Design a protein around this ligand. Structure first.
Ligand SMILES: CC[C@H](C)CNC(=O)N1CCC(=O)N2[C@@H]([C@@H](C)CC)C(=O)N(Cc3cccc4ccccc34)C[C@H]12
Ligand SMILES: CC[C@H](C)CNC(=O)N1CCC(=O)N2[C@@H]([C@@H](C)CC)C(=O)N(Cc3cccc4ccccc34)C[C@H]12
Ligand SMILES: CC[C@H](C)CNC(=O)N1CCC(=O)N2[C@@H]([C@@H](C)CC)C(=O)N(Cc3cccc4ccccc34)C[C@H]12
Ligand SMILES: CC[C@H](C)CNC(=O)N1CCC(=O)N2[C@@H]([C@@H](C)CC)C(=O)N(Cc3cccc4ccccc34)C[C@H]12
Ligand SMILES: CC[C@H](C)CNC(=O)N1CCC(=O)N2[C@@H]([C@@H](C)CC)C(=O)N(Cc3cccc4ccccc34)C[C@H]12
Ligand SMILES: CC[C@H](C)CNC(=O)N1CCC(=O)N2[C@@H]([C@@H](C)CC)C(=O)N(Cc3cccc4ccccc34)C[C@H]12
Ligand SMILES: CC[C@H](C)CNC(=O)N1CCC(=O)N2[C@@H]([C@@H](C)CC)C(=O)N(Cc3cccc4ccccc34)C[C@H]12
Ligand SMILES: CC[C@H](C)CNC(=O)N1CCC(=O)N2[C@@H]([C@@H](C)CC)C(=O)N(Cc3cccc4ccccc34)C[C@H]12
Ligand SMILES: CC[C@H](C)CNC(=O)N1CCC(=O)N2[C@@H]([C@@H](C)CC)C(=O)N(Cc3cccc4ccccc34)C[C@H]12
Ligand SMILES: [Mg+2]
Ligand SMILES: [Mg+2]
Ligand SMILES: [Mg+2]
Ligand SMILES: [Mg+2]
Ligand SMILES: [Mg+2]
Ligand SMILES: [Mg+2]
Ligand SMILES: [Mg+2]
Ligand SMILES: [Mg+2]
Ligand SMILES: [Mg+2]
Lengths: 189, 184, 191, 184, 182, 185, 190, 191, 180
């Protein structure tokens, strides 16, 4: 079940996630596919139309998923006028950590015991040599694209990103900070 | 869960629809086509002058379902803008190029893919032949419209669609599949 | 079918699902395996209750065999972050990250009912592929265990050495044993 | 379909309004959490008035059962227990857990007591740990059944070694219930 | 699936007029629902008759007994009307209706037979299960006897194997009082 | 299955052991295994009705009736049939171990012997459950009686001791009466 | 396909599958998981070889992940019972009952080749059903473990206390390490 | 169907399956995945051939994608143990322990035909369960790799540093490349 | 498989005829390599006949056969009956020069190597480079064997390409169509 919350100009009933969206909080708390991406793009656009000045809060607890779906979110984040803060809670892996890195400069956060993981894109291809070749070049170009943006966003060289993403690379919040994937570890109120 | 938004209480997609935004965010099958057709028809009825926005994040799908949307786009009075976000492949990229002239867009990192139609046939040689001609005709039809819509020659479309062909947003622009890359 | 509860408001009759009714009184139910979905729900509930009232206590009921470590830490960090004290009440059982969260309640406000069961053990996982890949997975789950153990030490007052011996294999505790161990503060006795 | 009654209530919610709780399935963590919540709510509404727990259950998880058990014993209100159809496993344990003098079964209700079930695979050391666990669990169950029924731990142990089917009248004689509810 | 009538679902609408529908296999869910319905109607009015529709192949013996005992316990007469079929615990409950108020419609089918079960494991466990089902059968057979007027000996002969009855046959047997006529 | 050559007739290892009056019961006991062993016994008798036969037993048991096929044949033939438990003998496995010729029933030191009650199943009508229950109960009395006769233990004790799985060392099996002797190096 | 091998005897030609050929020279191949079938075959082979010649050594090759404990003891007991010395030679790996049988070879005639892998751990098993049945199974596998550990103590010279610590979890040993442990006497060199 | 071959001897006609016919001339075929059965078969052949003739060379044809490391080492250790030189000849491919065994042939007598393919990579494995179990599995496969790499170093003349870099991911070599790597001594050129 | 007073395939093998009449896997390669080596030892002068009715299969398996054909002294004639596809038609082309044949209605098919790769980008890359190198290798040899250019082979094998026996002759895959 998703719990319901009720506020008391009338009495309005909200599912907990909708209630958070009313305070400009978007939950990316699952594997990233086209459906999750559509929902989050819609939310971003709606929040912008309501107010193009106020910050947005993107909660990321996600193992990642589709690169293109992740980029649908990424590009929408960069297009809209409001700063989109990113907050890692639990883990951010794959495009999950890419999106965390994509938050507004100075406003990328993770809570202390959150886990950040970076690695190289995964894919698959079968058929003729020529089809294998196309699929190879495609995922290689996609990786260059990902790594270039990470370099811009973290301050690390493409050479270093390439090394450090060659195999699964698990980072503490703190380590994610010094790497430049986030700006700040959120310390207890 | 699809979030709710209270202004009247709307699911987020229906709230976008009230502002003439249609989301093509899935595989194109008959159901998606009937939904999108129904939304286009409805928005025209509400206002035949104002632009409509068709978001495209789709790996494509059924060609006939794609043409259901294409024909409905072209038939109605309003300009239907097309915005590629994430990717448009197969009939997805077809519908992207079918947007109103000067109002086809993609955000910078969106991916566009063009390739030939896919199908299958089993049974007697005569049935194979019928299915072969059918999908060969369908390709000519698709290529002909892409030619008209992109400004490229049928000759060039045939070569470039022979195998999977992945394009960047900027590349889709110089190809003629979109008009403009939407910048921040 | 989750039962419905209806109250009489002056602006009509408001109807709640039973869990939602409890959440109005600042009670959160962790009554399932901990996966990312359950974590997102509980994080959301915690953040909402803080917005409603930054000073009143929150009650987290725990009947959970545990689950994802990271999902658990989502909840853990949210608990530690917010202003309100979060009480923890173990009812039924609390194993794996369940017993971790139980121990993570506000100091002095971690409870178990007399017949509730607490279990502590080491984290479980897997790895396949090249030796280098196995090595990365091994280091990962070993670090995760160090992390868990270091916090349990701070939370229970037991040494890290002792936590590691005692979690090496499945370790079932009674409520009263959970108390002397330092995982909870008090065994709630009947009213 | 669960029927509705007209404040429009599903039947079980309607019964809940009169402090009646239905345990009418296998006991798992979900069923436990639902019943715990109902108990906590009814107490909040009125800490003085009796609650009625209807039991038609083959039983299930022991820990889940003890979630319910501890909650019944913690709250101020007397929880009556009423076995209708059957109580087995933790089902009949909870039947015995009702308020003294307010444990009932209808004339043809069946009550079954037996030892806990479980499993264990792996190293000998792990089997050992699992075996000590289910044995301690059994000790715990039998000690509380002894407190509740007036029978000895020794007798519970022997009488639960294998499946033990009881009539309502036998269950009364055993101390599992206080009374057989005769017709009005 | 379920039509609406004005608002009520069709089954809820019938429930307002003290009609309960047993139209499925009898399991613990169906029994809880029916028991809840019976309890609720009683509270609303302890005097007025209740109508229990039966179109069921039967199912769990214990679940059936949950319904049966609830029927006998409440103040109101519970009428039973067999429509379509009543088998196993289905036909048992038909017979458990208020005396003089047990009905079937002319083409309704009633079937009686001995309870079904299973057992595997040690000989000792097969023995426990066998004694359990045999005792369950005597219980049912004893109650059918009381309800029909037939001797326990005859109930046991007639239930030894599947025994299908017409509504008119069900009447002379004692399972119902009356065939409802147009 | 290895082959051995004697000086030149070539045997599979098991057929060579059968030439020397050794029968191998080294699997679950089903009708096939019973018929094979019945046939090996009947033949070895015909060859020489005086000489001992050796029945190796490493078996978890299996079908009761199949087990009795072997038992009744062992008892029927003139020769003494020694039994040797190697590894384990459970269910009808240990029943056949006990059924060897008196004084000639053995287990090696680390062999394991398990006794327990028969297993079965029944579904359908009450009356059919009843028939299946009586059937397995009788089968158990019959087994127990014969164990009593062979072990020297009472039927009462056999029934208590077989009520659940009961694992015995070779030495325990000797003092139970299931075997006469533990074979030593 | 198992290769065939043909020799010229005095009394004609004799054709053997390779494993049967090796058996003629008193070599037994334990090269698989240990179940009842494998146990019955090896026991039969041991019995036959002793009947052929009670004095001459037998060679047991061990490349096995182990398997059934009882099937293992079938082999073990047969080895100890027959007059001839059974040499044990670990090639590839010996784990679980495999390494138990390796240690069970004739004293001073337990070998491994240099890159062979030996692994010792505790027995594995399973039980479901009533508390009472879980108890029985538990006792059964704990007794089995004592049994195995006691014999390993005798065979290696290590204390029972040490055997139990060192078998608590999977414990991989090099051939050289198996020698210092006392599971083998010698590492066979080229 | 494996074909049969029949020769004329002085004790009548002897009939061989083709593989057995090759074994008579001291040719062993490793032409499948390496599992325990294959290793036992090949070990037995090696031992048999040594007994027949402790002096004459043996020929080990290798067309194998590899397989079990321990199975591979059974063969490897048997090769080094017996008196006779074992020549290795790669035909088709050698990958994994297949290429390890290729390298393991007698010095100066390791060969591949011109279009044969040699692949080297790191060992593959799996682990599940408690952190402590994963760690044991990790150390095991890491040690296994060190063992493989150290022997390859001896056998090829390359350093351990290089063997590790070059085996990090799948590394396909031509016959000629295999020769300059030191995995083989010679490419067999047509007669 | 019928017997002859030898099984039929073994009977043919006595007369130096090898049958490649199935998919090519490592087993089939090992068998055919063994038969070739045997036949050479019996007589290093006399021709061998390789019957090909195969849809092909593993490339490395096929190269096992290919290399063994080229290594031994005897001319290996190739005779395509039924069909030859993938490495089937590669081996047909690998026969001794002047002694590669097909019966009139036999079918010959040439196409590019098939394969697969999943995992990290870097792994897809290695697999891609591998199958691409493998295709370069096949094409270079086909070129040497047919007289056709590498560039022509490349385009001609881009998709499935069916040839008649006659077309296979003028392509250079065989030397002659065997007539009644
Ligand atoms: C709840 C009210 C509603 C969201 C406000 N309306 C609105 O945002 N609109 C309509 C009017 C309009 O001119 N625009 C424009 C711009 C104002 C977008 C900021 C537009 O291009 N789109 C296309 C579009 C479509 C879909 C996704 C998208 C993502 C990212 C860039 C565009 C996208 C929709 C946009
Ligand atoms: C919410 C109000 C409503 C949408 C306004 N009504 C309307 O647009 N109508 C009814 C009256 C009418 O005359 N027409 C006509 C035209 C006005 C179409 C714009 C019509 O052909 N159709 C058929 C139709 C059917 C289905 C899909 C379609 C797609 C594309 C062309 C037609 C299509 C429906 C159309
Ligand atoms: C019912 C209304 C609403 C819940 C009150 N508003 C609110 O809690 N907000 C918005 C305004 C705001 O400034 N913040 C801030 C702080 C006030 C967090 C307490 C913020 O960082 N987040 C990010 C976030 C996002 C998601 C989960 C989270 C968990 C734990 C720390 C943060 C988290 C959201 C936070
Ligand atoms: C419909 C209104 C609402 C239910 C009344 N409020 C209430 O019951 N509350 C909040 C305020 C409060 O002080 N308490 C306290 C006590 C009053 C519990 C009766 C509390 O410990 N809990 C924790 C809890 C949590 C979960 C399960 C439970 C089971 C059994 C003992 C406790 C449990 C929640 C409790
Ligand atoms: C819609 C209002 C509500 C139904 C009226 N209240 C009511 O029936 N109640 C509460 C108060 C009360 O004293 N009783 C009593 C009696 C009045 C039962 C008629 C009671 O025993 N139960 C237990 C019960 C519990 C569950 C199933 C049941 C079956 C069959 C006999 C009992 C059963 C519940 C009963
Ligand atoms: C190697 C030669 C051959 C086995 C010797 N012949 C022989 O034993 N025969 C035939 C002639 C004969 O008179 N008999 C007789 C008796 C001599 C049995 C000892 C016989 O009853 N049977 C039936 C039989 C049939 C099957 C199984 C059996 C088990 C156990 C008792 C009998 C059984 C077969 C028996
Ligand atoms: C190739 C011919 C043949 C093997 C030589 N004969 C022979 O070994 N025999 C028969 C005669 C005999 O007196 N014995 C005796 C002893 C000589 C056993 C060494 C015996 O007890 N058995 C039983 C037996 C049965 C099965 C397995 C066994 C394992 C281990 C101890 C015994 C075992 C068989 C033994
Ligand atoms: C066809 C005739 C027959 C093969 C010649 N006999 C023979 O090779 N024998 C027996 C006599 C003997 O003393 N030895 C010795 C040596 C002569 C081994 C070369 C021995 O240790 N083994 C053990 C063994 C067992 C299994 C595999 C093996 C691998 C590799 C090293 C040993 C191995 C067997 C060896
Ligand atoms: C039944 C009679 C037997 C076939 C004649 N003996 C023979 O051909 N031998 C042994 C003696 C010998 O010097 N050689 C040599 C050459 C004579 C191979 C022609 C050799 O390299 N091999 C390795 C080998 C192994 C496997 C496949 C192969 C393919 C193709 C090149 C080699 C290959 C085996 C070869
Ligand atoms: Mg922005
Ligand atoms: Mg238009
Ligand atoms: Mg706090
Ligand atoms: Mg109470
Ligand atoms: Mg009544
Ligand atoms: Mg006899
Ligand atoms: Mg000995
Ligand atoms: Mg050597
Ligand atoms: Mg040649």
């Amino acid at each position: 079940l998703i719990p319901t919350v009720i506020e008391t100009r009338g009495e309005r009933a909200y599912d907990i996630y909708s209630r958070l969206l009313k305070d400009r909080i978007i939950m990316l708390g699952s594997q990233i596919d086209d459906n999750v991406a559509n929902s989050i793009v819609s939310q971003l656009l709606f929040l912008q139309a309501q107010d193009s000045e106020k910050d947005i809060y993107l909660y990321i607890n996600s193992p990642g998923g589709s690169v293109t779906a992740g980029f649908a979110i990424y590009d929408t984040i960069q297009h809209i006028k409001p700063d989109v803060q990113t907050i890692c809670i639990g883990m951010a892996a794959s495009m999950g950590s890419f999106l965390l890195a994509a938050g507004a400069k100075g406003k990328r956060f993770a809570l202390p015991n959150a886990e950040v993981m970076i690695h190289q894109p995964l894919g698959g291809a079968q058929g003729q040599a020529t089809e294998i070749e196309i699929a190879a070049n495609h995922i290689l170009k996609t990786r260059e694209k990902l790594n270039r943006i990470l370099s811009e966003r973290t301050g690390q060289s493409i050479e270093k990103i390439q090394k450090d993403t060659d195999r699964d690379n698990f980072l503490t919040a703190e380590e994610a900070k010094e790497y430049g994937l986030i700006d700040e570890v959120m310390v207890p109120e």
